[PDB]
Design a protein around this ligand. Structure first.
Ligand SMILES: [Ca+2]
Ligand SMILES: [Ca+2]
Length: 397
């Protein structure tokens, strides 16, 4: 019968020994011992003379596994990816990347982009504009489009890392939404001058409200969008004609999804603000995560935290965390795939193949996390019972 203790530690050496079918085996770590036992056993301390009372076998386990699988007390799952560009204005700008899995300290020196703020970046020979929503493709050699869309010739793109490029959602071209049948007569009963794609205005209590004429109705646009439309094609109008509300209220209203913000676009200076981050967060009970783009002078963590960073030899990012993590990912690989990883305090991810294995390790309720950030971590060996059952020549250290 099972006698309650299948895991032991030599009182003198603190070495681990696991009991398998009446025989002791040295085992590399607690993680491996629990994998083979099928439950998160805690070692019983005994003298070597006690261990010598059982037959001893070869070393078992996963030597590359973390010693154990502790997890930070964690209120909320928070994951942040940060690009820092060194010598942004030089002929040799360099991007460094950090993964932050811990609460942030946000201030005026490093905070979310505001709605009118944007960063011009380069990736693989192409340029993208980064806003609070993600990245938008733009070709800067198209001087007129670029200018109309609020981007000055004084703007210099700076490189983003591959990880940041993957993390930032492609929200579509930085352009005015194309207007079908632009230039053609309106079908809305408006004056002949107001062709499809033209801009008019009506006077309100808050002053002028601008509209664009669409094939299926009229849509409100802000002043910036109105100017951008007219800068591209004014349709022969010196200014947006003033219309009477009696004429306009009768027409179907539509939505024109211009990406241009109300205020003049402010292009952040990378030398001033070398840090660009994508921060992702989700609390237990939440139906959706919330994500935002940060821009500032350094990482959004305390100065004390700025040197608890760890970079793996074969990792791309320096990792900052407040303890271990147990996370659940969902990704199209290319089919919708749910996966689980344990992340050790060193910033290595280890696959947890199924719920049964998680239970063996004493891991429960994995936090939802973004694969875009988590899979940037170095991938260690999968934590499986099959792997842990393997015998080895050499004793644990
Ligand atoms: Ca600062
Ligand atoms: Ca700011």
């Amino acid at each position: 019968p099972h006698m309650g203790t299948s895991l032991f530690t030599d009182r003198a050496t603190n070495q681990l020994y696991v009991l398998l079918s009446g025989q002791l085996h040295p085992v590399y770590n607690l993680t491996s011992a629990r994998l083979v036992l099928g439950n998160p056993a805690n070692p019983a301390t005994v003298k070597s003379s006690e261990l010598s009372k059982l037959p001893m076998g070869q070393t078992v386990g996963i030597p590359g596994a973390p010693y154990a699988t502790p997890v930070s007390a964690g209120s909320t799952s928070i994951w942040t990816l940060c690009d820092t560009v060194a010598r942004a204005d030089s002929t040799s700008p360099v991007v460094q990347t950090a993964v932050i899995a811990m609460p942030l300290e946000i201030d005026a020196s490093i905070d979310p982009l505001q709605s009118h703020e944007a960063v011009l970046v380069s990736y693989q020979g192409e340029t993208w504009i980064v806003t609070t929503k993600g990245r938008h493709a733009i070709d800067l050699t198209d001087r007129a489009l670029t200018s109309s869309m609020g981007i000055p010739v004084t703007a210099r793109p700076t490189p983003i890392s591959e990880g940041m490029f993957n993390a930032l959602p492609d929200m579509g071209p930085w352009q005015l939404p194309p207007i079908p049948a632009a230039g053609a007569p309106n079908s809305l009963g408006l004056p002949d001058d107001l062709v499809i794609g033209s801009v008019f205005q009506i006077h309100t209590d808050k002053g002028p409200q601008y509209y664009v004429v669409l094939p299926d109705g009229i849509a409100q646009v802000n002043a910036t969008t109105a100017a951008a439309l007219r800068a591209t094609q004014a349709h022969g109008l010196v200014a947006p004609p003033a219309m009477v509300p009696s004429l306009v209220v009768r027409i179907a209203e539509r939505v024109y999804p211009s990406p241009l913000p109300d205020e003049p676009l402010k292009i952040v200076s990378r030398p001033q603000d070398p840090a660009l981050c994508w921060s992702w967060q989700r609390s237990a009970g939440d139906q959706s995560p919330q994500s935002t783009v940060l821009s500032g002078r350094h990482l959004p963590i305390s100065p004390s935290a700025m040197n608890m960073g760890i970079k793996q030899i074969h990792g791309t990012a320096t990792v900052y965390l407040d303890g271990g993590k147990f996370v659940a990912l969902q990704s199209p690989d290319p089919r919708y795939t749910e996966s689980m990883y344990y992340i050790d305090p060193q910033g290595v991810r280890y696959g947890v193949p199924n719920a049964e294995t998680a239970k063996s390790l004493g891991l429960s309720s994995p936090q939802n996390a973004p694969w875009e950030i988590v899979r940037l971590l170095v991938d260690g060996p999968v934590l499986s019972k099959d792997a842990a059952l393997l015998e080895h020549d050499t004793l644990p250290a």
